[PDB]
Amino acid sequence: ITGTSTVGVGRGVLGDQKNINTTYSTYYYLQDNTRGNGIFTYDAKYRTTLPGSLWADADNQFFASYDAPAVDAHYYAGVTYDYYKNVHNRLSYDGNNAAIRSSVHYSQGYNNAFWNGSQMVYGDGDGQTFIPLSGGIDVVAHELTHAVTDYTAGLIYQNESGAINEAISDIFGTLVEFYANKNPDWEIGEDVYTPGISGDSLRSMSDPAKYGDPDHYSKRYTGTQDNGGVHINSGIINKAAYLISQGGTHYGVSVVGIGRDKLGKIFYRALTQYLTPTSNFSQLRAAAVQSATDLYGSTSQEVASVKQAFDAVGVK
Ligand SMILES: [Ca+2]
Ligand SMILES: [Ca+2]
Ligand SMILES: [Ca+2]
Ligand SMILES: [Cl-]
Ligand SMILES: [Cl-]
Ligand SMILES: [Cl-]
Ligand SMILES: [Cl-]
Ligand SMILES: [Zn+2]
Ligand SMILES: [Zn+2]
Ligand SMILES: [Zn+2]
Ligand SMILES: [Zn+2]
Ligand SMILES: [Zn+2]
Ligand SMILES: [Zn+2]
Ligand SMILES: [Zn+2]
């Protein structure tokens, strides 16, 4: 809509207060004109029809419980936009400042969130397994990174390529969580998963085996479930990324950590320049080594640490 850019105030899913960019035209709308071609948040009204109605509010204050998932979807889309622009010089998910649209209150008791090719979609969860999924910044950024992948490498969502696709989304979901300084960790989905249970998550990047996921190529899942293990085998790559950043000793291989910024630069270059739709784990290693070589030089510690980390998880 056309109107005056304003700043409202609201509370997110976890009860935290934040300012959000809105647009005034009789009502205040969840329309952020400050980022690219805009960030737009919609009410799906518990239907499965998309996108629903552009979110309208009478007083620019968003403290109702019904408001909370919209506040966080809107705010965390903006944080993700800022991360890709400020850190990687990428303008929105397509690199051409495409508008980011999100719908909240999708369906009823729906324990999922997804990028559907043109917008974000968030369920509210069932209140036991999940609370509204836009409350997790790493979830938001994970799903928006699938859009980045679709517009660059085009990794297909099965077998090793699909596990890479998932791991890329976990890596940048985590780097956005650190960028925002929003209770950062190397776990995925901890802020919205099992509200009754403290200290768990959907999966761990620092210790995938904590939840039974593989942390070495020799332990990879080889069956047909989960599209060939896309959420299971991602642990192999997630552990390598953790080692590249933080260092450690894993299956007897010592890795010198190089930190989070260089992790992000190496993987962003690999994704945007070198990966293809059917890249496998071995090709990811080659792409990451070449990216580190491009950025830091063939004899650098950065290249040596990438090699060490992939050796540690058994990927040659
Ligand atoms: Ca209000
Ligand atoms: Ca996390
Ligand atoms: Ca929990
Ligand atoms: Cl560990
Ligand atoms: Cl371990
Ligand atoms: Cl470690
Ligand atoms: Cl170990
Ligand atoms: Zn997803
Ligand atoms: Zn995913
Ligand atoms: Zn966290
Ligand atoms: Zn798992
Ligand atoms: Zn899965
Ligand atoms: Zn280990
Ligand atoms: Zn370890």
Chain centroid to Cα 288, Å, comes to 19
CATH of 155-315, one of 1.10.390.10, 3.20.20.80, 3.30.300.10, 3.40.640.10: 1.10.390.10
Catalytic annotation on 250?
no
Distance 249 CA to ligand 13 centre (A): 6
Tokens of 226: 């989960």
Specified resolution (Å): 1.6
What is the distance between the alpha carbons of residues 223 and 57, in angstroms, rounded to a whole number? 49
Task: Give the number of other Cβ atoms within 10 Å of residue 30's Cβ.
Answer: 28
DSSP string, 5-45: EEEEEEE-TTS-EEEEEEEEESEEESEETTSTT-EEEEE-T
Annotated ligand binding at 43? The verdict is no
- Burial of residue 12 (CB within 10 Å: 0-12, 13-18, 19+) is buried
> Is the N-terminal amide bond of 214 cis, ω within 30° of 0?
no
Annotated ligand binding at 191? The verdict is no
Same fold, 6-154 and 155-315: no
Task: Give the number of other Cβ atoms within 10 Å of residue 72's Cβ.
Answer: 32
Annotated ligand binding at 193? The verdict is yes
Upper half-sphere CA count for residue 128 (Cβ side, 13 Å): 2
What is the distance between the alpha carbons of residues 316 and 312, in angstroms, rounded to a whole number? 10
Asked if 59 and 67 count as a contact pair (C-beta separation under 8 A), the reply is: no
DSSP string, the chain: ---EEEEEEEE-TTS-EEEEEEEEESEEESEETTSTT-EEEEE-TTSS-SS-EEPEESSSEE-SGGGHHHHHHHHHHHHHHHHHHHHH---TTTSS---EEEEES-SSS---EEE-SSSEEE----SSSBS-GGG-HHHHHHHHHHHHHHTTT---SSHHHHHHHHHHHHHHHHHHHHHTTSS--SEESTTTB-TTSTT--SEESS-GGGGT--SSGGG---SSHHHHHTTTTHHHHHHHHHHHHH-EEETTEEE----HHHHHHHHHHIIIII--TT--HHHHHHHHHHHHHHHH-TTSHHHHHHHHHHHHTT--
Catalytic annotation on 216?
no
Distance 290 CA to ligand 7 centre (A): 26
Which among 137, 115, 118, 160 has a CA at the least distance from the CA of 277? 160
Q: Identity (one letter) of the amino acid at 68? A: A
- For the structural domain made of 6-154, what CATH number should be given? 3.10.170.10
Distance 114 CA to ligand 9 centre (A): 8
Chain centroid to Cα 91, Å, comes to 16
Residue 211 sits at φ, ψ, to 5 deg, of -110, 15
**Please, which residues have CB within 8 angstroms of residue 49's CB and are 6 or more apart in sequence?**
none
Which among 300, 297, 244, 301 has a CA at the least distance from the CA of 267? 244
Tell me which ligand sits closest to the C-alpha of residue 209: 5
Which among 91, 81, 250 has a CA at the least distance from the CA of 172? 81
Helices 281-296 & 301-312, crossing angle to 10 degrees?
170
Parse the chain into domains and list their residue ranges.
6-154, 155-315
What is the distance between the alpha carbons of residues 83 and 91, in angstroms, rounded to a whole number? 10
What is the distance between the alpha carbons of residues 206 and 257, in angstroms, rounded to a whole number? 13
Distance 250 CA to ligand 7 centre (A): 4
What is the distance between the alpha carbons of residues 233 and 221, in angstroms, rounded to a whole number? 6
What is the distance between the alpha carbons of residues 284 and 161, in angstroms, rounded to a whole number? 9
What kind of experiment solved this structure?
X-ray
Length of the chain as a residue count: 316
Asked if 76 and 21 count as a contact pair (C-beta separation under 8 A), the reply is: no
Asked if 99 and 39 count as a contact pair (C-beta separation under 8 A), the reply is: yes
Per the DSSP assignment, residues forming a β-bridge with 264 are none
Biggest CA–CA distance in the chain, Å, is 64
Q: Are strands 100-104 and 39-43 parallel, antiparallel or unpaired?
A: parallel
